[PDB]
Design a protein around this ligand. Structure first.
Ligand SMILES: Nc1ncnc2c1ncn2[C@@H]1O[C@H](CO)[C@@H](O)[C@H]1O
Ligand SMILES: [Mg+2]
Length: 329
């Protein structure tokens, strides 16, 4: 039986999604797995999207201020995990920020900053503590979500790709695959080892102010997600000012922070995504404080002066490719 390398890529969930596999299984088995990966990505686009009218999430948001809504266990568990990171991060990551994000999403489309009072009003409808998850304990009992605050809206944009990367890894494993690189719009999961000999996957992290083509550094990892938050992934400009996609929930404006990017290395991409978002909002010192709560996670920060700091679990695995950057040790 020979090793073969495969990849497949499609535009889906608003972005380029690519999966690379090494396997000695029959090629028909790998093809079947990849078929299911990309079918899943189409199906979940219709469950999780905050910017479509027909999604399960859109339906949930339509019942804000009303009765509990039944959801499948997958969505329920994702919402539980999101609320866990909201609480741990003091709301720096907030999955109920839709009232504010939607004002900014139209701003992006129109290259215009939302209004002062409107934004102030929207912030009154973002209390994630008013998202009530309840699930009975008896056989077959439903899972429910209630949005208690009138006009509050869930937005899982910061974590949807991480969730889908974890679902993809679980699907690959279900198909007896153990070597893959999952890349959903830049949210990475490195499953197992690649082949050259078996070697770690070398995950690239971009120059925050670069074109994105080439990585500024790489980190060698196994069985790890790598998710990076940076202003650069999505912004608009108006009258000399850049407004990026990661909102500070205290201000209702794009976060003003002391790092250019934060990359989180975690066993679960869902977790890495939530934590990367929180850490970008919190800034470096408070991020270090939060991350001490999660010993199984590593982090790499790129500062505006091109210094790079990485935690102990990964620092020896970092290789700088763009010599303008310096890895502090
Ligand atoms: N502080 C935040 N916490 C959670 N999600 C956010 C936050 N700011 C923006 N978002 C959402 O996550 C996306 C950025 O990853 C945004 O497009 C928006 O949907
Ligand atoms: Mg700040």
């Amino acid at each position: 039986a020979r090793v073969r390398e495969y990849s497949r890529a499609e535009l889906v969930i608003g972005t380029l999604c690519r999966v690379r596999v090494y396997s000695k299984r029959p090629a028909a088995e790998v093809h079947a797995a990849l078929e299911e990966v990309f079918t899943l990505l189409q199906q979940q686009e219709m469950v999780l999207s905050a910017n479509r009218d027909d999604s399960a999430l859109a339906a949930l948001n339509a019942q804000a201020g009303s009765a509990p809504v039944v959801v499948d266990r997958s969505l329920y568990a994702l919402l539980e995990r999101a609320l866990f990171f909201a609480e741990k991060s003091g709301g720096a990551f907030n999955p109920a920020l839709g009232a504010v994000v939607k004002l900014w999403n139209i701003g992006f489309d129109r290259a215009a900053v939302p209004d002062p009072d409107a934004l102030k009003e929207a912030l009154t409808r973002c209390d994630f503590r008013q998202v009530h998850l309840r699930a009975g304990v008896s056989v077959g009992a439903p899972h429910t979500v209630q949005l208690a605050q009138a006009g509050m809206q869930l937005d899982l944009g910061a974590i949807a790709k991480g969730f889908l990367a974890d679902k993809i890894v679980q699907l690959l494993t279900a198909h007896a695959l153990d070597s893959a690189l999952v890349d959903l719009g830049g949210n990475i999961f490195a499953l197992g080892l690649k082949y050259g000999q078996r070697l770690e996957w070398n995950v690239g992290i971009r120059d925050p102010h670069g074109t994105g083509q080439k990585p500024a550094l790489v980190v060698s990892v196994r069985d790890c997600s790598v998710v990076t938050s940076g202003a650069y992934e999505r912004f608009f400009e108006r009258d000399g000012v850049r407004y990026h996609h990661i909102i500070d929930p205290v201000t209702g404006f794009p976060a003003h922070t002391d790092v250019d990017s934060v990359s989180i290395f975690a066993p679960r991409s869902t977790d890495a995504a939530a934590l990367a978002t929180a850490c970008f909002v919190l800034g470096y010192e408070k991020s270090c404080a939060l991350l001490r709560e999660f010993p199984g996670v590593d982090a790499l920060f790129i500062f505006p002066d091109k210094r790079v700091r990485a935690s102990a679990g990964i620092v020896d695995r970092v290789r700088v490719l763009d010599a303008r950057f310096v890895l502090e040790r």
